[PDB]
């Protein structure tokens, strides 16, 4: 009991500093302490009950600055604290957590498209580079299942990608997995039961409502019910066995829609609206303040 869906940052006209938390048990939203620096294209994650905001870019009136930052929000204090910065700025980053360690994957720095990957140790407040991916990927979706890290889709600067790869920590090695059926960058990628889901994104021509899932045993990708709304640069998380997608861009509107996927019925429903439409958020779940 008591867990909220936290959304940090995002983009609407400029990068945003908002931190807001949704309570699925009562439909309420809380506005919490703003990020110290506005950021879009970031990722969120949780370790030890603390919320982390990783990477991104500050698109502001005065400039566009890619972020190497890691910042930590403690729901007990409603305060953000800086942590050690990454080796490199990473906008349009993907993040996953393995056994209490944060992996920062890919992303962009100016015209540079990273294949590099680094790992944060919260107790030591240190980052260290690990093996790079086999592919340069920005707008990459990342998720962790069974202590293996998956990097899904993205953009290498020339083509959006249907490819995906898996990192095996004990060997510090990446291997390609079966590619998705659809090219996607800026998809929401998460884990639910024994599958990696890729929802939405941009294929180079259109924002997508399709959703497909990779079964890590059978190595297949299967489409599930599509979302009601096409969206790229959406936030995603999982809570109590359901997927939540937040915001994004549909080619017309920065969406405020939050949809929820029930795997038992293979259906999506609209569960709430964010307080304002935005794309490029970071999202994670932890205890309420
Ligand atoms: O939301 C963002 C930044 O975060 C992104 C995250 C993943 C992929 C792409 C971007 N930029 C918006 C600019 C205006 C057009 C819609 C995307």
Numbering used by the authors: 324 to 612
Quote the study on this structure.
The interaction between Kelch‐like ECH‐associated protein 1 (Keap1) and nuclear factor erythroid 2‐related factor 2 (Nrf2) constitutes an attractive drug target for diseases involving oxidative stress and inflammation. Under physiological conditions, Keap1 targets Nrf2 for ubiquitin‐dependent degradation and keeps Nrf2 at a low cellular concentration. A promising alternative is to inhibit the Keap1‐Nrf2 PPI using noncovalent compounds that bind the Kelch domain of Keap1 that otherwise interacts with peptide motifs of the Nrf2 Neh2 domain.
A total of 768 fragments from the DSI‐poised library were screened against the Keap1 Kelch domain using X‐ray crystallography at the XChem platform of Diamond Light Source. Data processing resulted in 80 high‐resolution (1.0–2.1Å) crystal structures of bound fragments, which together covered the entire Keap1 Kelch pocket, including the five subpockets P1‒5. Re‐synthesis of these five fragments and testing by surface plasmon resonance (SPR)‒which we have previously used to measure weak Keap1 binders with millimolar affinities ‒revealed clear, robust binding for fragment 1. This fragment consists of a central phenyl core and a cyclohexylacetamide substituent and binds the Keap1 Kelch domain with a K d of approximately 0.7 mM and hence a ligand efficiency (LE) of 0.25. Detailed analysis of the X‐ray crystallographic structure of fragment 1 with the Keap1 Kelch domain, solved at a resolution of 1.14Å, revealed three major interactions with the binding pocket: a cation‐π interaction between Arg415 and the benzene moiety of 1, a hydrogen bond interaction between the amide carbonyl with Ser602, and the cyclohexyl group of 1 occupying the hydrophobic subpocket P5. Based on these data and its synthetic tractability, fragment 1 was selected as a starting point for F2L elaboration.
